[PDB]
Design a binder for this molecule. Structure first.
Ligand SMILES: COc1cc(-c2ccc(CN[C@H]3C[C@@H](O)[C@@H](N(C)c4ncnc5sc(CC(F)(F)F)cc45)C3)cc2)nnc1OC
Ligand SMILES: COc1cc(-c2ccc(CN[C@H]3C[C@@H](O)[C@@H](N(C)c4ncnc5sc(CC(F)(F)F)cc45)C3)cc2)nnc1OC
Lengths: 486, 490
């Protein structure tokens, strides 16, 4: 059941055609989530999944056009014919409206019961292939759901939202952590239910609320400061969900261009206002292919951080990682270290759980790979300056401080001997003359009155080893002992 | 143009009439594939595709007869009229002979060249419509090809083989994997051609030889132990290709019966002797409505395995699954677990490629659904016996060993979190008393020399070996097993 105002835009023969359909849909009060996902799903299938052009399928044709130099030549876009898309579309709605009898669910006050939402969730759930590998690229879109009955984790969430729209339930919306997804609904929008699995397979929590996740201060639930989406933001989600990767080292430039354009569309309508990750994703895309007259990536990264601070109580980690990354790839060592410090400064007030494995890996790689490497490549510059700058030393101490504070209160230790080496290796990359320029205090007087670097640890472990750090001989044994504990 | 010897059999007013026509055809040096496919297409059409008796239709007539009880009533069969079939038949042979000019290609010795076969394939390729975004039933037949141009993947191959018979090329024959189809020609039959696609997202190997697939030890090519049909088997193939699915939960009781009789007919003429799936197919049918004075289902599954061993080096998977299935349905836990274990043993010697996703799903459903069911429905029969027979436990370990072994040396991993839980759940289904009764030896001395016990089992896979002790322990180290069942030197 498409509206005639939707069909009038088909067939879509190019990137711009798709962008146009998105602008159309964002215009309406409730953009058709299922329609937009199908389209992106259809387009991604031929641009990344199966690029071999069929020539004996009815309704399937390819649209030639100039490709950008260097390459030059032609590029072939999959023509999204109405007949294919509409048929896919009707298969989804048929499946949904047939399996869910709203009559059985006394939906009063324009508010969806918890039982209704569990039901819809279960429909989508029981529809999936039992066998597939769940960590596979390109099973995010409803195209993939209807075609292959394969959905990735956050896909299931998105699909359950899309089902609810198709059922006329305008009160069920997609909630997004920085690494998980569920559903919110209810009068105030204050009711939650899990609908998908997280991590390695654990589909356990389906149906329950997210109260316990928020309470245990895990990064997965962002202490409550997760994203609650509106329809417009759900479109932003699926645009971010576009996966341009063909293989491990190869990207479809059409999918890159298209995701980039859709984000600017969204950006301009201001729908990335409360979406730090989107803004960062947009910035990442601008460093690759900078579209002219648009803000520089740096500006975008900052918009992301601003957003997190205004709307998410500055409880998001990735906005700083996004920025850190930039300064690493541009060799801005001082700024690069600062951002990593800022990142750690956020994680400090969280408690590390098993569910949080993803950010752990990210922090682990920062501490034990990105930072050590960064310093080496900077010591290669001198022996032929950041290493002379005690700010950078203070940044590095602040980074570890965050990590130690993070650990405090956690039901699982963070730091082990793996970290010990690299701390020492990294520490021993700053002349003892430089390290000593950093005063590590408590502060003597609170506040102010109208009438080298300084630094203050917040963690036990780090303030416990206040001196070992500024000494001229790195006591490479007492540090490793103290960084680790029980 | 039909021969005179064939027309005298129309009109086909019933199943038995269709049988008779088949008998006739099966008694020649070349049974007409095109004639028999068309007839089958036709009958399946009005029997599953569109069961509504046309009001506007002139030449289509329907024959009633008594229906099987309990339901009862009368069952109306679509009369295959000579005019219609001849028409369709003329249409096809016309279309094909129209597109190929046999003189363009020098065919010396009665041997067909690669070019000729490429073309005949191309002619079928650019005539059909592929149903890319859906799986369409009832589009296997040439009947479908002419009517709708719709043709599924293996339907293409069969179409090239029929089109070649229509051009009177008696050398081009049908190659049959367990989940693919291609074409064999050439002097001895050692010429291989790809004519169709496989699944979705796989590249395009049309025109090439299946050498690479044999090489890479993928199940799609059976390491070489695939079927090369003779005409008689190609007929058996299209009989298997009969498709009684009306919808997803409803079967055409008349198409079942037609197929069951056609297989028994092919069986008696000895045309199923080198076709394990056909023998499996028939057996499943005999489980449903057993025909009297015939072999038991059990007997037929074995003949399928037997066949597999004889002609195909025991490199086939389905023949075991066919047996396993029957056992599960009879709740013969012991045989079922065994049959599954044998299935794994065969597979152990394969590598796993993307194109094999079909046998994957199938193993997965065994590991993570079927076996678990069996054992859970058994813990109940005890509380109210196999779950304390260490034989069974051994079967279960051999199973897993094969899958692990399968995975070894594959481009893609095979095991993931999804499997981990049910392994553990199934290990726990046997008391540690029983699981310890099983001894897992590597072997100390090679071979023997001239001048009681419980189950003994040797693992072939590094994965199962490295976790031999964890399996027999009384405390099932749930966590450690799961960890080790997964691995990545990738
Ligand atoms: C460890 O070393 C380094 C790390 C980083 C770095 C830089 C940026 C990031 C953030 N990565 C983005 C990529 C993108 O997929 C973002 N994700 C997960 C999302 N983007 C947009 N919307 C969403 S919604 C969501 C939750 C879900 F998936 F729905 F459940 C997740 C999500 C996360 C992570 C790491 N950069 N540089 C490094 O070294 C130089
Ligand atoms: C996984 O759990 C269970 C599985 C099974 C089971 C039982 C039987 C099978 C084999 N299925 C048959 C059905 C039938 O279509 C057979 N097919 C594919 C063919 N039959 C005959 N000829 C051919 S030729 C061919 C390849 C092609 F199509 F030509 F390209 C395929 C093919 C295969 C597979 C699994 N049975 N029971 C189970 O639990 C009880």
């Amino acid at each position: 059941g498409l509206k005639a105002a939707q069909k009038t835009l088909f067939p879509l023969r190019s990137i711009d055609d798709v962008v146009r359909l998105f602008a159309a849909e964002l215009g309406r009060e409730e953009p058709d989530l299922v329609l937009l996902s199908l389209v992106l799903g259809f387009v991604e299938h031929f641009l990344a999944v199966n690029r071999v052009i069929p020539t004996n399928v009815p309704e399937l044709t390819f649209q030639p056009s100039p490709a950008p130099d260097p390459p030059g030549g032609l590029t072939y876009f999959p023509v999204a014919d109405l007949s294919i898309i509409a048929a896919l579309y009707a298969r989804f709605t048929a499946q949904i409206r047939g399996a869910v009898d709203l009559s059985l669910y006394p939906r009063e006050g324009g508010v969806s019961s918890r039982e209704l939402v569990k039901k819809v969730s279960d429909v989508i759930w029981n529809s999936l292939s039992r066998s597939y590998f769940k960590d596979r690229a390109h099973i995010q879109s409803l195209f993939s759901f209807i075609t292959g009955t394969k959905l990735d984790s956050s896909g299931v969430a998105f699909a359950v939202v899309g089902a609810c729209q198709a059922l006329g339930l305008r009160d069920v919306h997609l909630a997004l952590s920085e690494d998980h997804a569920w559903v919110v609904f209810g009068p105030n929008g204050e009711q939650t239910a899990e609908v998908t699995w997280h991590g390695k397979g654990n589909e356990d929590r389906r149906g329950q609320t997210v109260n316990a996740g928020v309470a245990e201060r895990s990064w997965l639930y962002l202490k409550g400061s997760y994203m609650r989406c509106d329809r417009k933001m759900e479109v932003a989600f699926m645009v971010c969900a576009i996966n341009p990767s063909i293989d491990l080292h190869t990207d479809s430039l059409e999918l890159l261009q298209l995701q980039q354009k859709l984000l600017w569309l969204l950006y301009d309508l201001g729908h990335l206002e409360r979406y730090p990750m989107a803004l960062g994703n947009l910035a990442d895309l601008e460093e690759l292919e900078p579209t002219p007259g648009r803000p520089d990536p740096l500006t975008l990264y900052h918009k992301g951080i601003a957003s997190a601070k205004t709307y998410y109580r500055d409880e998001h980690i990735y906005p700083y990682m996004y920025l850190a990354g930039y300064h690493c790839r541009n060799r801005n060592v001082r700024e690069a270290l600062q951002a990593w410090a800022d990142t750690a400064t956020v994680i400090q007030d969280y408690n590390y759980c098993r569910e949080d494995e993803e950010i752990y890996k990210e922090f682990f790689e920062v501490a034990n790979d990105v930072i050590p490497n960064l310093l080496k490549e900077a010591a290669s510059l001198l022996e032929a300056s950041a290493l002379q700058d005690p700010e950078c030393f203070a940044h590095l101490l602040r980074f570890y401080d965050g990590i130690c504070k993070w650990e405090e209160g956690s039901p699982t230790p963070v730091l082990h001997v793996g970290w010990a080496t690299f701390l020492v290796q990294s520490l021993g990359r700053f002349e003892g003359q430089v390290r000593q320029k950093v005063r590590i205090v408590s502060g003597t007087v609170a506040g102010t009155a109208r009438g080298g670097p300084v630094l203050t640890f917040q963690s036990e472990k780090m303030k416990g080893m206040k001196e070992l750090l500024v000494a001229t001989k790195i006591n490479s044994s007492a540090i490793k002992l103290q960084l680790t504990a029980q």
